[PDB]
Amino acid sequence: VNVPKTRRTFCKKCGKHQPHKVTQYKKGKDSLYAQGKRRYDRKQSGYGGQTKPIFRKKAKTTKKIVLRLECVEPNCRSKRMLAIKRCKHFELGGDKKRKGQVI
Amino acid sequence: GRRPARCYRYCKNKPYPKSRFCRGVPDAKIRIFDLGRKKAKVDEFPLCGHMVSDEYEQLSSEALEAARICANKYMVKSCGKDGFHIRVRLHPFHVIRINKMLDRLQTGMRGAFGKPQGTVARVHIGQVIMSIRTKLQNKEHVIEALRRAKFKFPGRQKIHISKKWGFTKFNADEFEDKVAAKRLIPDGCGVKYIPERGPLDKWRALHS
Amino acid sequence: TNTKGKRRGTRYMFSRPFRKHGVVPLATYMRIYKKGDIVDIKGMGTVQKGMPHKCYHGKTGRVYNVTQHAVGIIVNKQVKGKILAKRINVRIEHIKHSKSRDSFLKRVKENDQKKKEAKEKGTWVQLKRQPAPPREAHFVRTNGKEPELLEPIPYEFMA
RNA sequence: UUUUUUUUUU
RNA sequence: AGCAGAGUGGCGCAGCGGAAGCGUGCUGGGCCCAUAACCCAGAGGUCGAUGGAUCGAAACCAUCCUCUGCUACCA
RNA sequence: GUCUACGGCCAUACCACCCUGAACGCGCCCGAUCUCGUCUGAUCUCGGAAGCUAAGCAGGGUCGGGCCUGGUUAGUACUUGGAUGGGAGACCGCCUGGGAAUACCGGGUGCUGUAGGCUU
RNA sequence: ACCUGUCAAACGGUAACGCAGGUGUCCUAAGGCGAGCUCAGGGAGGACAGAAACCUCCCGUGGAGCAGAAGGGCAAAAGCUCGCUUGAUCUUGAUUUUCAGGACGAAUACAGACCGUGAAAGCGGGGCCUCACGAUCCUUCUGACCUUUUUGGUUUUAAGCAGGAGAUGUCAGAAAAGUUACCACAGGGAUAACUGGCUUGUGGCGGCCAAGCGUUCAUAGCGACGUCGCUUUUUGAUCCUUCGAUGUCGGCUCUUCCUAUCAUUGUGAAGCAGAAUUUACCAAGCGUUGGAUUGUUCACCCACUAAUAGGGAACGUGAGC
RNA sequence: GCGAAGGCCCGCGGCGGGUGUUGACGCGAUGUGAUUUCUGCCCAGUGCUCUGAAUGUCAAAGUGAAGAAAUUCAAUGAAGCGCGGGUAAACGGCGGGAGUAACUAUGACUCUCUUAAGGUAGCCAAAUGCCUCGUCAUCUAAUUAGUGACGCGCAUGAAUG
RNA sequence: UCUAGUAGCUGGUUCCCUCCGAAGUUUCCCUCAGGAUAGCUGGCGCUCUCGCUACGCAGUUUUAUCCGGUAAAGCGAAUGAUUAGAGGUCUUGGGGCAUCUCAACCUAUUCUCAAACUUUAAAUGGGUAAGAAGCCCGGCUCGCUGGCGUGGAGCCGGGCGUGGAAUGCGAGUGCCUAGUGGGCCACUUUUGGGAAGCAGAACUGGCGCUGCGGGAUGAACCGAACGCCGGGUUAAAGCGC
Numbered sequence A: 001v002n003v004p005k006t007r008r009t010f011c012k013k014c015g016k017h018q019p020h021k022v023t024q025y026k027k028g029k030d031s032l033y034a035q036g037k038r039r040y041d042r043k044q045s046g047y048g049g050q051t052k053p054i055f056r057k058k059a060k061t062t063k064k065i066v067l068r069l070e071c072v073e074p075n076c077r078s079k080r081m082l083a084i085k086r087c088k089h090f091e092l093g094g095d096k097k098r099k100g101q102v103i
Numbered sequence B: 001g002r003r004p005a006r007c008y009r010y011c012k013n014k015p016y017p018k019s020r021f022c023r024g025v026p027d028a029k030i031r032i033f034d035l036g037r038k039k040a041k042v043d044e045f046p047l048c049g050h051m052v053s054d055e056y057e058q059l060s061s062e063a064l065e066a067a068r069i070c071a072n073k074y075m076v077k078s079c080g081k082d083g084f085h086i087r088v089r090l091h092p093f094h095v096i097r098i099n100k101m102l103d104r105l106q107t108g109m110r111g112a113f114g115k116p117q118g119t120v121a122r123v124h125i126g127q128v129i130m131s132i133r134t135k136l137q138n139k140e141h142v143i144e145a146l147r148r149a150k151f152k153f154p155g156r157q158k159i160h161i162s163k164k165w166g167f168t169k170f171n172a173d174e175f176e177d178k179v180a181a182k183r184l185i186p187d188g189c190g191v192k193y194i195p196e197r198g199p200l201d202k203w204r205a206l207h208s
Numbered sequence C: 001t002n003t004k005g006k007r008r009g010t011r012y013m014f015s016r017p018f019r020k021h022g023v024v025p026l027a028t029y030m031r032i033y034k035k036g037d038i039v040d041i042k043g044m045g046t047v048q049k050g051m052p053h054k055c056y057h058g059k060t061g062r063v064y065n066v067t068q069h070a071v072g073i074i075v076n077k078q079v080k081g082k083i084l085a086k087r088i089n090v091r092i093e094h095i096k097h098s099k100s101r102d103s104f105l106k107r108v109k110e111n112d113q114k115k116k117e118a119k120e121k122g123t124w125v126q127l128k129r130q131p132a133p134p135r136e137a138h139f140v141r142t143n144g145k146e147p148e149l150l151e152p153i154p155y156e157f158m159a
Numbered sequence D: 001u002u003u004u005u006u007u008u009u010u
Numbered sequence E: 001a002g003c004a005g006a007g008u009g010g011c012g013c014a015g016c017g018g019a020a021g022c023g024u025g026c027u028g029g030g031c032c033c034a035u036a037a038c039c040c041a042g043a044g045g046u047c048g049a050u051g052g053a054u055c056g057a058a059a060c061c062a063u064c065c066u067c068u069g070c071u072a073c074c075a
Numbered sequence F: 001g002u003c004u005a006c007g008g009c010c011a012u013a014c015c016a017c018c019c020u021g022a023a024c025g026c027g028c029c030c031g032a033u034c035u036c037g038u039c040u041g042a043u044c045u046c047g048g049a050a051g052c053u054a055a056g057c058a059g060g061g062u063c064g065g066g067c068c069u070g071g072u073u074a075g076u077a078c079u080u081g082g083a084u085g086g087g088a089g090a091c092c093g094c095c096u097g098g099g100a101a102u103a104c105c106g107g108g109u110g111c112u113g114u115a116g117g118c119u120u
Numbered sequence G: 001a002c003c004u005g006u007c008a009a010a011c012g013g014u015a016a017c018g019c020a021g022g023u024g025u026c027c028u029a030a031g032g033c034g035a036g037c038u039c040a041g042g043g044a045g046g047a048c049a050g051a052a053a054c055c056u057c058c059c060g061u062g063g064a065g066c067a068g069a070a071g072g073g074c075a076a077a078a079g080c081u082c083g084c085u086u087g088a089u090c091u092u093g094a095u096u097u098u099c100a101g102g103a104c105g106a107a108u109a110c111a112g113a114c115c116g117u118g119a120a121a122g123c124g125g126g127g128c129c130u131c132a133c134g135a136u137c138c139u140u141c142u143g144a145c146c147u148u149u150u151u152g153g154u155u156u157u158a159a160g161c162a163g164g165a166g167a168u169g170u171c172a173g174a175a176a177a178g179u180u181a182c183c184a185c186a187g188g189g190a191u192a193a194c195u196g197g198c199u200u201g202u203g204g205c206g207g208c209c210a211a212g213c214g215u216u217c218a219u220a221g222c223g224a225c226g227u228c229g230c231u232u233u234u235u236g237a238u239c240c241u242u243c244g245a246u247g248u249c250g251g252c253u254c255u256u257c258c259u260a261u262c263a264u265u266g267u268g269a270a271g272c273a274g275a276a277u278u279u280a281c282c283a284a285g286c287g288u289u290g291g292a293u294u295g296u297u298c299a300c301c302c303a304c305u306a307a308u309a310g311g312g313a314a315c316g317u318g319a320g321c
Numbered sequence H: 001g002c003g004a005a006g007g008c009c010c011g012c013g014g015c016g017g018g019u020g021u022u023g024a025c026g027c028g029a030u031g032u033g034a035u036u037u038c039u040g041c042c043c044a045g046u047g048c049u050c051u052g053a054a055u056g057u058c059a060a061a062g063u064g065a066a067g068a069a070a071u072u073c074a075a076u077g078a079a080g081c082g083c084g085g086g087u088a089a090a091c092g093g094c095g096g097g098a099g100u101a102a103c104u105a106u107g108a109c110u111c112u113c114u115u116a117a118g119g120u121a122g123c124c125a126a127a128u129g130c131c132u133c134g135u136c137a138u139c140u141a142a143u144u145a146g147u148g149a150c151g152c153g154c155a156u157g158a159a160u161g
Numbered sequence I: 001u002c003u004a005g006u007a008g009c010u011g012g013u014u015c016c017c018u019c020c021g022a023a024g025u026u027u028c029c030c031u032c033a034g035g036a037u038a039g040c041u042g043g044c045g046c047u048c049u050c051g052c053u054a055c056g057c058a059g060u061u062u063u064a065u066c067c068g069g070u071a072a073a074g075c076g077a078a079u080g081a082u083u084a085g086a087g088g089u090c091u092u093g094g095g096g097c098a099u100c101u102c103a104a105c106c107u108a109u110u111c112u113c114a115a116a117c118u119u120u121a122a123a124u125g126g127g128u129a130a131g132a133a134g135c136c137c138g139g140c141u142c143g144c145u146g147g148c149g150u151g152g153a154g155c156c157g158g159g160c161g162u163g164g165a166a167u168g169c170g171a172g173u174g175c176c177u178a179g180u181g182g183g184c185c186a187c188u189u190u191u192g193g194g195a196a197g198c199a200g201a202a203c204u205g206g207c208g209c210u211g212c213g214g215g216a217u218g219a220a221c222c223g224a225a226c227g228c229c230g231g232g233u234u235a236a237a238g239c240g241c
């Protein structure tokens, strides 16, 4: 799919429709000090071995694409997360198709 | 190579014709249904005889082929090669299946849906199987020819001499009067029926 | 087993009648449905919005809500030995007024007015419906013409 | 740096 | 997921601030009447690319697709 | 007796061809300055009023096709319920109720609502 | 885990390793709105041009297209071409479908915002409709002048609240390779490997018709194309009985039974001159052998013979070997 | 494999034990299985083993830097893997597809593919051959048996001797 | 010794009478010899109703009114399949030879068909309604809707009992709840299979849980269902012994 780099959508902070910059969300790195990571490390220390499951039966081949929308109002600059459906290929700001072209 | 006809006789399935859902069907044994002098006019073969089914069964294409051959062979010998016209009024459209002829294959009743084996024709009680039209003097030969073709069919059949003129749908007692009164216009082996329900130009052409 | 698809087996029930395709006639949108009146549900495949489920096609219920394009209906549905009053939203195209209720409302009117006429005329009139009574005694005239004698016909083996 | 064969008595 | 790399007449490669090649693969010609490769000659490289820098780039820089090696594994 | 604008039911209204059309109207028609749009004022948009019912449109016609409706097909085909009915079976008959569809044969060929005209 | 048509017996629901198929996607447009057009195909014409280039008129109820399979739906449409846009956005409840009337997915009408389109009425909160997907715990991002961070206060950090995402396809979601003939236990006739029982496709044995064969001649003897049966000495199909056990291949030994008769008794027919042979009837009283090879049943050969027929009895018979 | 601060091995533990009252003509670990005659080709794969590093990845500790600190970042970064070597009397493996010699049939000489080589010498319906009771001969009156031969050998074959 | 280890699996589980009385089906589960869930059962009640010195309901019909695409039928109606003649002709057609016959196409007929075809279209089906929660008058409220005394809804008074088809019946409602979650057979319908005392479905009844008369015998057939008895009479079936 091809998603344009900008779009006019509602802004919760502004209370109205505003232009937004569109980017692709990427997962941040693990904190190493989140409570779940601390608990897992405490469990993993010692002689028990592996204490939690390791997932191995992977079935999904694609991934849901999450768009980060940032308001262009300088005083607002608020962000929102907007997911679209699964797609194998994702392009942001690709060329727009036209019907008069010679194949 | 072929199962006995008693295995496929009692019309136990829904019609299973050749279509995009049923492919790989072997060709039927009978491919010719009209025999003798097909080009004869209505007025030369007035007598008609039928082999009428008396059971609700299905007749194989091989049986229809065998009956047609033996009826034709007798009527050529007795009435000449151009003194009759035989029409087989049954077309094999039902496809019968067979399960696999029995390491690398799954035996038993697992996946037991069959493959096409042959074609049979479903016939109802009182339905015509074969028809022969000839001259009025060959009545005994028509009965004899249809009698011998009975033995090729599993069930019970009756031989009936029609009250109609040849292969047409009009009674033999009224046929000549209708032709004279221009209600019946001969065309080919059959006849055309002319009503009074069209443009008057057609009526003008008929009476001109 | 078969699928749980919403429109499975609606090949004929949601098809338009022969030579009755095309534009929906506009009087169907002009019918006025008030709260409390009885409507027949009959899904039309020309309009795919607000379409009733196949289990409500041929069912009759009463209007409990009126919206801009649709109507809420309280419809009885039988589910494995219990009957429950479902609430469904159906667009206007898939419903029509039920004529059984209109007939009864007319009979109430002629009953009340017949009571008023009877009281003013000092007479008594029958108001309850009655099942078809046994036929009364009567005479049948021959008009000097003997009844025609029928007889079974001989058997003839046709083609 | 390589270059095989060539035909039957007459 | 982290690091370090790389894509080149079709190939095995060689340099960073432009002059694009070598033994091979195509082709034409010397020399002998030899059946040679040396010998000369030409064509064949958008160096996988999007933009940025600079007086200028396969070559320098950020990302994509085509992989490599090793490392890591609580939905 | 008719038309126009807007419709309802969507062929008894459609399709093919022929005849007739008074008066209003509806059109065909004339033109491109402006509004508007085109390769093209053909269409669309605009300004008109010399001519014409040839066309559209209306009414009628056709042993017309279709469509609607009725007979026939036929108490046939099928079917609820029943039997220690028949038949080796395939299937069939009867009791008790319901009950079709072609071919074939006739009749018909828009009704109408709101508003505004003509038939003076 | 899902979807289409059928099965399915004209409400709905309805099974099988039933039948015919599709899915783990694809789309900034193929989402939304408006305007303007009409598609497949065919006929007749026009320089190069021809069965297929492009131009024109006519007919065209859709016989095209609407991305995915199929069904439905659709014509100044939902199809084609342009123009403008992001209703594929921010929220609270109600409802439908599967259903236990928990959930997820998907879907339907509203309501409050903020917008798009069009002159406007209206239409639009994704795809014309029915498929295209995912819990707790954990992680990650986003939102508030948010709440906690434990004697108080400031600042980092961490925890919490709400909405997205990283996934479990065995798709209501354990983290998972093999072998056992050295084997073990609890059970199962809910279930295979024998007999037996149903069935007889296959095997085997018969019958009907008569196209031909038989020098001549359908039927002495055969018998194509077809068609009707019988048997359980073949093999299958099924899983009713038996898994707290019905000893298992073959041979040897011994008895009895069947006839679908190889011989022998008595006959009928012949393409029966005699001899030999073939066909059929009554008929199972009597007989149906000795050996080489093979574990073999089966087979094959050697040799006698009147003939060297076929079978059953828990595929007779292991407290008989 | 090992020259004793060792090789192989035991032990909860001690520079505790066995080999070892031993020292390569020794001890430990494997395979093949007298004698005779031979022991072909393959190091691509999996192992084992050597060092050139061009050297990439590479934990803890240590070093430096920013912040108020917890923290974070950067450079550095052993063995191992990677990278290049040996090695089959290590585990094992040993094909086709073409190009062709005066009746044929057969068919050396040339070139190629996977994943390196294409089964050499011998041997065989073998205790190894499905088809198969292979074909020929011999053994008998008769032989699915025996023996001797034959060679595209389902699936023979050289210390898996 | 831990240890009476665990077992969704096999075996057993002790007195009488009385009353009521099943399920082998739905959904989820590393679920298929097991559970949870709904259903079927029982128990305890409770809230009411009628009558003597009716609150309402129904495995039924009727009367109205909708819904449907199976049986049938159809193919000179669409989509597919398909047999044979006939009448015309543009023929980027062929063959035998100015040509002429075939083939092709068209038109009007004709034979035979469809679970995944259809214009048409049953029988048996399913839904709703058949009043007092109704009908008819008068007024009030609204921030919704709006040319309007508009519309819609709500609320407050008043009047009207011939109780607005037949038949039958007393209803409603709460909590707790065991067993079951292997089924099997038959008429009709129906899928796979040559078929099967085979495998898989729908509806109803039955066996399982059930004995009794008859079918000689027999789970299921026919008749009929059961406290202990006397008389009488039947069903299905019988009446030579």
Ligand SMILES: [Zn+2]
Binding pocket: A011, A012, A013, A014, A018, A071, A072, A073, A076, A077, A078
């Ligand atoms: Zn903002």
